[PDB]
Amino acid sequence: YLLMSASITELLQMCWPSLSEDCVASHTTLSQQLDQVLQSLREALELPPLSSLVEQAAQKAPEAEAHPVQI
Amino acid sequence: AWSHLPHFSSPDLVNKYAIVERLNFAYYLHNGRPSFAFGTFLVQELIKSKTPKQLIQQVGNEAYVIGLSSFHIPSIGAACVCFLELLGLDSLKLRVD
Numbered sequence: 001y002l003l004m005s006a007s008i009t010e011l012l013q014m015c016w017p018s019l020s021e022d023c024v025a026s027h028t029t030l031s032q033q034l035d036q037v038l039q040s041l042r043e044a045l046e047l048p049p050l051s052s053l054v055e056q057a058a059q060k061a062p063e064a065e066a067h068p069v070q071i
Numbered sequence: 072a073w074s075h076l077p078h079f080s081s082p083d084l085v086n087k088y089a090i091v092e093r094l095n096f097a098y099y100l101h102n103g104r105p106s107f108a109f110g111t112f113l114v115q116e117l118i119k120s121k122t123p124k125q126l127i128q129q130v131g132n133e134a135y136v137i138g139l140s141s142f143h144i145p146s147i148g149a150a151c152v153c154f155l156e157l158l159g160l161d162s163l164k165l166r167v168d
Binding site: 017 | 145146148149152153156162163166167
């Protein structure tokens, strides 16, 4: 699994939770997903107060349903 | 009174100082003989473990001590991990250390 994801004493001293069958790739996928999300998160959220909210409230409902932040 | 001509093994003295030892698992672990380590440990002790829970806990304590002894060296650490896994206990205390 380590080799495939990349695609002994090398491993048996790392610090994933347990050496069970799934947990390794499970954590790898979880961490990668959280990072790939939060990166685009900060990217979007980095983009008048009342005025801005008023304008954002003047669009079409289907458009508002696809708010990238909400997305 | 040493009546008998004694030597390096005077019978009464030999009893007075008969102190024998068996090849304890530290031999394999300290060398690093994992599967043989567990297997010989079982051969000597598993049957001999009249208190399997108590003996298992004691062996675990020994394993933790041994592992902590050798932080820098890689081979000792790997052996510690394998022996803990073959023991049947948690594999996070030694790794955390």
